[PDB]
Ligand SMILES: CCCCCCCC/C=C\CCCCCCCC(=O)OC[C@H](O)CO
Ligand SMILES: CCCCCCCC/C=C\CCCCCCCC(=O)OC[C@H](O)CO
């Protein structure tokens with residue numbers, strides 16, 4: 001593949017419907033003041049995903065399998081349940097985003113939107129490796145081109161450069177800002193990948209480590225520029241204008257209207273649907289690998305797909321706002337990150353696991369600082385959600 005090739009394919013996988021929810025709402029409600037969050041969360045994701053990838057290369061096993069073989073039964077069971085909750089919140093945002101996109105495209109109610117998504121995800125579940133390549137290449141194009149749109153639009157929108165520069169200085173402005181900051185971190189780090197991304201020769205093992213290190217930083221850098229662009233465009237579009245339903249995904253197409261014209265609405269919803277269909281399908285398979293890795297057995301794949309749809313339909317029948325619950329799921333995912341980092345930081349520092357590929361002492365320290373920072377942000381948010 002060409003030089004930039006790997007950076008493009010891995011970046012579209014990072015574009016969750018939860019990124020749309022957090023970037024649009026972040027810019028429309030708090031201007032440019034959360035740009036440092038997207039930047040910080042992206043750098044932390046570069047460290048974390050590198051440790052996750054180097055653990056699979058050095059040890060030949062994934063994190064659930066290493067926990068199952070090395071830790072006591074009650075701790076394996078605890079981390080299995082915690083990993084299953086991460087899979088629930090991860091698939092909830094993706095499945096609900098696709099159903100919402102169906103509603104934006106056709107006008108059907110959210111219930112039937114989730115039913116359409118359910119048939120598609122059930123049918124996509126049956127298809128083997130043959131057939132996924134034409135569909136995953138098409139959804140990659142929609143999501144990639146909507147990302148290039150925001151990269152171009154961030155220049156044509158003429159954003160307030162003084163406010164853009166100030167937005168890179170870390171500032172939390174109220175309790176609602178921390179809630180959205182936590183959601184941005186949860187949407188960037190993606191703890192479900194931590195448990196799955198891990199899934200011979202020392203000189204050959206170092207080649208894959210150096211090769212993976214370059215590809216993930218090019219992809220995270222591209223995904224980080226697009227996320228900041230989507231937030232900055234949302235800030236320039238809505239912030240300080242008292243627009244009806246500002247930051248909401250039902251009116252988010254207005255961010256690309258001066259560029260795409262009358263096509264902005266369909267092109268946004270199509271990209272939202274493609275971002276949710278591919279993500280909901282790969283995540284429910286990743287949930288199957290995680291249980292088999294933790295427990296040594298797995299439930300039928302159709303049953304897991306059904307259980308993951310139950311929170312989606314319940315949220316719909318409750319009448320809850322889809323854009324609001326997409327942000328909540330990313331907030332919950334951010335609470336699962338510190339639990340995922342503890343086995344990651346410990347295993348990658350052991351020679352009997354990594355061999356000659358033991359992590360540098362400095363990057364282990366940086367990883368623990370990242371874990372302490374996220375615990376601090378989660379506890380700070382949890383304190384203000386219980387009064388105090
Ligand atoms: C709490 C939620 C739990 C819901 C409980 C199930 C609800 C029934 C739905 C579909 C059953 C029919 C679809 C599956 C039947 C064919 C699938 C199959 O392959 O056989 C099933 C069996 O597990 C060997 O694999
Ligand atoms: C304000 C920001 C606060 C965020 C906190 C700082 C996060 C960024 C720090 C370093 C990034 C460098 C990571 C680039 C890739 C490094 C490779 C790696 O992660 O691990 C390899 C290991 O060292 C093999 O032995």
Ligand SMILES: CCCCCCCC/C=C\CCCCCCCC(=O)OC[C@H](O)CO
Nearest residue numbers: 349350358359360361362364365368369372
């Ligand atoms: C507690 C709240 C405020 C604290 C804020 C600072 C966080 C604590 C400092 C470092 C964390 C532990 C990192 C240092 C231990 C790393 C383990 C290590 O590097 O050991 C060598 C490794 O085994 C090579 O093989």
Ligand SMILES: [Cl-]
Nearest residue numbers: 070346347350
């Ligand atoms: Cl261990």
Ligand SMILES: [Cl-]
Nearest residue numbers: 031032160163
């Ligand atoms: Cl401003």
